[PDB]
């Protein structure tokens, strides 16, 4: 592919290394997003290896709830990623606009998330930064995991890297322990709470107080939450990684079953 | 902004695409890609013959 295979429509957003454009591939008139990255900026920042790893991971995943990277190409100055267009845009914007999601919307997102994450884990990919800002939304509002920045393929070894986002950090990262794929189970629980409440569960005035709340699992449920939703969150936000509810458990949880209105997109044929 | 990319023509084309998915695996996934280790190296132009 080259840039002249596409009609450029309009900017969708400014990334750190270039813009993302709404584009239409000329030959099939197929609408996609083209993410443009400047090679010199990437090299200056020293992110080449990180970018390679992110592309290597995202470009080999095929799931309805993971944003697809169809292909990629480069020219003299730019690297171009050909991505699935998410017509309903950023999840975080929707949550901010509404303040909190209702149970139906939240359960639906949870089922989609757990399915995408299970797909990942079956391939020994750990995501490591699930939060609303890393999620986009499809035509029917389907969750799409979009940012694989912190992800890793971890076939054998446990990991040590502190990664993710303050409010979402699992206790084991804060304590300097090794971690595994169960980090994603914890983050799923933080996400479910934020969806329903509109604030993450360990919100605090300082980074040290947030860490303290996390490692103590100082979870205080607002009285408006349903017993089912509290049950799921409680089962994900376990101090001990091995005790967290598995992703198949999230999919099977009664609150998810009773409230989710998940619909699988049409597929070719 | 070209017309295809705004308001209604866009809305309409997105709907159309959701319900008539293309064989992306074939249409994009069989097409060659640059090696990852070559992304930061020399871009060679598409055409060179004499
Ligand atoms: N596939 C997409 N479909 C629709 N909008 C997109 C898509 N990808 C990116 N965008 C929009 O483009 C914006 C910036 O792109 P993104 O890849 O997120 O960079 P960012 O969010 O600024 N983070 P980074 O690129 O890491 O700085 C996003 O916030 C979206 O609003």
Residue numbers in the entry:
A (entry chain A): 88 to 356
B (entry chain D): 798 to 847
What does the publication say?
The Aurora family is a well conserved and well characterized group of serine-threonine kinases involved in the normal progression of mitosis. Mammalian cells possess three Aurora kinase isoforms (Aurora A, B and C) that exhibit different subcellular localizations and have distinct functional roles. The most conserved C-terminal region of INCENP (the so-called IN-box) is sufficient to bind and stimulate the catalytic activity of Aurora B. The CPC complex is involved in numerous mitotic functions, and the timing and mechanisms of each of these events are carefully regulated by its localization within mitosis. As expected, deregulation of Aurora kinases has drastic intra­cellular consequences, rendering these kinases attractive drug targets for small-molecule inhibitor development, targeting the active-site binding pocket which binds the ATP substrate.
We sought to investigate this further, and grew crystals of Aurora B–INCENP in the presence of a nonhydrolyzable ATP analogue (AMP-PNP). We also report the structure of the same complex bound to a nonhydrolyzable nucleotide that induces the formation of a crystal contact mediated by the substrate-recognition region of Aurora B and a neighbouring INCENP molecule. The C-terminus of a neighbouring INCENP molecule occupies the Aurora B substrate-binding region of an adjacient symmetry mate. An unexpected crystal-packing contact in the Aurora B–INCENP structure coordinated by an ATP analogue is also reported, in which the INCENP C-­terminus occupies the substrate-binding region, resembling the protein kinase A inhibitory mechanism. During the structure refinement, we were intrigued by the precise docking of the INCENP C-terminus onto the Aurora B substrate-recognition region. Although unexpected, the crystal contact favoured by the presence of a nucleotide within the Aurora B ATP-binding cleft may resemble the inhibitory mechanism observed for protein kinase A (PKA), in which an inhibitor protein (PKI) was originally co-discovered. Our structural data predict that phosphorylation of the TSS motif would disfavour its proximity to the pThr248Aurora B residue on the activation loop.
